Amino acid sequence: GEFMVSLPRMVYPQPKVLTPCRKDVLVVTPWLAPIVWEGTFNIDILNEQFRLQNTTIGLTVFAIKKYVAFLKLFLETAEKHFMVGHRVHYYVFTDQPAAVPRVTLGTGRQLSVLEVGAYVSMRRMEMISDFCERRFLSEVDYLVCVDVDMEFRDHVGVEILTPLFGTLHPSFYGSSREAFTYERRPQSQAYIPKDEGDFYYMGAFFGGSVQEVQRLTRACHQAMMVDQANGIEAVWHDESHLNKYLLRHKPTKVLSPEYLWDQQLLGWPAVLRKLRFTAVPK
Amino acid sequence: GEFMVSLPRMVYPQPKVLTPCRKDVLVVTPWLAPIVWEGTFNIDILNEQFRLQNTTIGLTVFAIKKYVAFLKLFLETAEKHFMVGHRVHYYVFTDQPAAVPRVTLGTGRQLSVLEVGAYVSMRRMEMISDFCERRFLSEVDYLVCVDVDMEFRDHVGVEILTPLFGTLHPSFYGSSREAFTYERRPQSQAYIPKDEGDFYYMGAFFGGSVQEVQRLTRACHQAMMVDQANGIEAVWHDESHLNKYLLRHKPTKVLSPEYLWDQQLLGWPAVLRKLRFTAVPK
Ligand SMILES: O=c1ccn([C@@H]2O[C@H](COP(=O)(O)OP(=O)(O)C[C@H]3O[C@H](CO)[C@H](O)[C@H](O)[C@H]3O)[C@@H](O)[C@H]2O)c(=O)[nH]1
Numbered sequence: 091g092e093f094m095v096s097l098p099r100m101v102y103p104q105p106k107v108l109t110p111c112r113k114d115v116l117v118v119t120p121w122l123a124p125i126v127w128e129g130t131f132n133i134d135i136l137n138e139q140f141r142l143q144n145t146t147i148g149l150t151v152f153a154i155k156k157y158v159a160f161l162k163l164f165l166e167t168a169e170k171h172f173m174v175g176h177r178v179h180y181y182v183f184t185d186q187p188a189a190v191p192r193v194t195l196g197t198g199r200q201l202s203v204l205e206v207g208a209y210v211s212m213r214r215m216e217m218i219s220d221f222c223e224r225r226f227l228s229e230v231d232y233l234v235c236v237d238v239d240m241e242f243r244d245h246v247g248v249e250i251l252t253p254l255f256g257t258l259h260p261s262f263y264g265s266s267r268e269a270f271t272y273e274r275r276p277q278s279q280a281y282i283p284k285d286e287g288d289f290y291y292m293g294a295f296f297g298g299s300v301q302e303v304q305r306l307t308r309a310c311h312q313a314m315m316v317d318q319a320n321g322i323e324a325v326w327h328d329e330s331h332l333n334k335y336l337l338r339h340k341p342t343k344v345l346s347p348e349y350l351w352d353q354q355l356l357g358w359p360a361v362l363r364k365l366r367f368t369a370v371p372k
Numbered sequence: 373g374e375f376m377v378s379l380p381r382m383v384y385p386q387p388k389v390l391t392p393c394r395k396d397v398l399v400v401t402p403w404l405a406p407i408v409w410e411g412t413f414n415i416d417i418l419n420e421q422f423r424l425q426n427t428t429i430g431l432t433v434f435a436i437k438k439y440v441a442f443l444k445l446f447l448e449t450a451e452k453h454f455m456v457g458h459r460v461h462y463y464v465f466t467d468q469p470a471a472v473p474r475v476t477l478g479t480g481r482q483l484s485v486l487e488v489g490a491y492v493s494m495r496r497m498e499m500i501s502d503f504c505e506r507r508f509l510s511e512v513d514y515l516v517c518v519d520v521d522m523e524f525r526d527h528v529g530v531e532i533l534t535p536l537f538g539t540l541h542p543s544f545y546g547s548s549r550e551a552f553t554y555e556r557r558p559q560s561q562a563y564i565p566k567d568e569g570d571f572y573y574m575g576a577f578f579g580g581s582v583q584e585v586q587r588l589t590r591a592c593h594q595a596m597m598v599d600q601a602n603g604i605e606a607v608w609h610d611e612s613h614l615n616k617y618l619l620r621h622k623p624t625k626v627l628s629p630e631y632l633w634d635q636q637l638l639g640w641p642a643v644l645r646k647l648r649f650t651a652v653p654k
Pocket residue numbers: 151152153154155156157158236237238239292293294326327328329330372
């Protein structure tokens with residue numbers, strides 16, 4: 091859509107058609123979406139492309155009740171690793187604005203504290219889609235929506251940006267679809283039969299353009315409201331609905347488990363060259 | 373951008389993260405564009421996605437002077453293999469409208485004969501960008517621009533569609549960049565130094581959204597006019613300029629040489645599971 095000026099001259103290694111970047115993993119989905127692993131991207135090319143568009147990335151994070159304790163490490167490590175060099179707007183949703191730590195930000199980065207009422211299962215999807223629609227459309231190009239009980243340990247950058255993305259759940263990337271913990275009751279809007287499903291995406295890291303993220307969160311919120319009216323709560327709450335949405339609306343990139351990992355639970359397997367965004371004990 | 377309704381339930385093999393589709397070839401570029409090979413896509417998923425948008429594909433082909441002889445086989449084989457099931461509009465540019473063969477088309481497909489003056493090196497880029505701009509924007513979603521001295525032998529479908537694509541030249545996909553026959557004189561707008569270049573794209577098959585194809589063809593036409601004013605003609609004419617454009621504006625998919633092959637010259641190597649669109653003797 092938007093007019094893109096030419097890239098400057100760059101000197102980098104030639105990609106070789108008869109040499110894969112990675113032979114140990116699937117790097118493209120069957121609907122031709124890249125699956126983002128280390129070794130698949132030249133970050134210099136991508137940084138150029140996204141800086142030439144003056145890209146602004148919004149990051150939403152919820153810190154309600156005791157989870158305000160996680161904000162200091164989350165934000166300080168985001169400053170070290172998340173979209174460095176690009177414009178970033180953090181949106182911290184909290185019931186305790188005074189408990190938000192004072193974190194020093196790099197240039198071109200800003201943080202907004204958005205107070206929410208105390209307490210729900212629907213809160214994140216509702217808030218991203220019903221309350222913040224207009225603000226996000228005016229302020230950022232992409233939205234990234236993550237859990238707070240996390241820290242950045244390595245690069246998370248513009249390689250993730252695309253109209254719509256989900257992230258492979260670290261516990262299920264090697265699982266067959268029948269083993270996925272999708273909602274299996276046909277009475278739920280999140281229902282997925284045992285013979286359907288591409289991947290099990292984790293609810294803790296998804297994103298896309300503002301328009302696509304509002305579409306996803308609106309759809310998930312509406313589906314959760316239908317379930318509530320029908321007296322059913324999906325097995326994994328908003329994650330169950332996110333999985334149903336991404337089954338029916340294929341993401342345009344999929345992030346590998348580099349982007350959502352728990353080292354205490356799962357170690358550091360050979361397939362992960364980097365642990366980028368990792369669980370903190372809760 | 374445009375609102376996308378949900379995919380229906382579909383039953384197909386689960387993609388497996390720890391099993392690549394292809395281990396013998398590069399299937400994604402370093403800027404995260406898919407490289408389209410057989411085995412990388414589920415055409416049922418893609419057909420659903422593109423049919424749900426009622427996608428219309430325009431195909432431009434030039435048949436000037438003796439090359440009108442190639443139209444019958446080109447069009448009859450396009451009917452068997454090109455975008456079958458989707459809406460197709462062929463645009464045949466010719467100096468001999470009466471020499472266009474009467475080819476029977478499947479439903480949802482149409483052909484327009486567009487007369488051009490007899491005779492130039494710039495003609496295709498000029499015509500696609502200066503003369504047809506308004507018509508294409510109203511009539512089709514994507515444009516596909518190909519040589520006529522060709523036949524379809526196998527499936528060429530919506531897996532190629534994306535905002536901007538080029539095709540790997542069949543003679544150079546295994547070559548190092550210093551061997552690419554880019555324009556090497558710095559006096560040409562098409563100049564690419566020996567340490568730059570991702571791929572050598574062939575001028576005989578490129579495309580994208582109407583907007584991106586008009587951008588590319590406008591840029592190439594303008595650059596060719598500068599060269600003409602400066603008394604220089606690039607070594608491979610519009611192909612040299614196409615290569616310069618796609619170096620500076622990275623394509624969002626790259627087609628493998630399945631999509632542009634010469635079997636008399638190059639045989640049928642192991643890396644090609646299908647020969648889709650192939651040279652006819654000229
Ligand atoms: O008191 C709270 C509780 C939550 N939160 C917020 O919600 C996020 C998800 O919760 P959590 O990390 O516990 O679940 P995980 O197990 O890591 C994440 C998973 O489990 C959830 C239920 O606990 C849902 O099912 C979710 O959809 C799924 O991904 C948390 O990071 C906070 O940003 C908050 O601010 N205050």
